[PDB]
Design a protein around this ligand. Structure first.
Ligand SMILES: C[C@@H](O)CN1CCN(CC(=O)O)CCN(CC(=O)O)CCN(CC(=O)O)CC1
Ligand SMILES: C[C@@H](O)CN1CCN(CC(=O)O)CCN(CC(=O)O)CCN(CC(=O)O)CC1
Ligand SMILES: [Cl-]
Ligand SMILES: [Cl-]
Ligand SMILES: [Cl-]
Ligand SMILES: [Cl-]
Ligand SMILES: [Gd]
Length: 129
């Protein structure tokens, strides 16, 4: 599924991302835009063999099982393919574990470079929330 901006905001708010570990909702919408273009089916291979999956491009090195990243972990306890579904439940729940692990939202490269220090409220402006 390719989400609209306001559609995704509403979905993310319903699963409790708004102000999760102090990160306002506009930060999450901004990350998803630049990580995946709001597309749940996005995949991207990294140079060490791992792959990033879904709307927030979660990495098979630590977080999910894709059967081909040898010596990895699966700390969200899921197949990487569940992170490509039109329902974002599994992506949101896994992301809650990542952002809590000590590095905050800096784990998402595109957030650090394109969203950090900007007017992030602009990304939910106009939405009926
Ligand atoms: C809870 C998360 O920390 C899981 N974590 C993967 C688990 N392992 C081993 C472990 O963390 O016990 C990898 C070890 N490694 C450095 C280290 O921890 O020493 C990873 C660093 N990051 C995050 C961080 O530590 O900042 C990756 C996420
Ligand atoms: C093996 C190294 O990871 C040693 N580690 C010291 C041992 N402990 C806990 C533990 O690692 O079992 C520290 C707790 N902690 C992070 C965490 O573990 O969750 C501090 C951050 N760093 C590393 C990091 O995690 O990125 C300190 C280095
Ligand atoms: Cl915001
Ligand atoms: Cl694997
Ligand atoms: Cl959803
Ligand atoms: Cl933080
Ligand atoms: Gd770690």
């Amino acid at each position: 599924k390719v989400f609209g901006r306001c559609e995704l905001a509403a979905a993310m708010k319903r699963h409790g991302l708004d102000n999760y570990r102090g990160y306002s909702l506009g930060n999450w919408v901004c990350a998803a835009k630049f990580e995946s273009n709001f597309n749940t089916q996005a995949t991207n291979r990294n140079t060490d063999g791992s792959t990033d999956y879904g709307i927030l491009q979660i990495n098979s090195r630590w977080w999910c099982n894709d059967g081909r990243t040898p010596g990895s972990r699966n700390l969200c306890n899921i197949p990487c393919s569940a992170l490509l579904s039109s329902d974002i439940t599994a992506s949101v729940n896994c992301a809650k574990k990542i952002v809590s692990d000590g590095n905050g939202m800096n784990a998402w490269v595109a957030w650090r470079n394109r969203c950090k220090g900007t007017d992030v409220q602009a990304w939910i402006r106009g939405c009926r929330l």
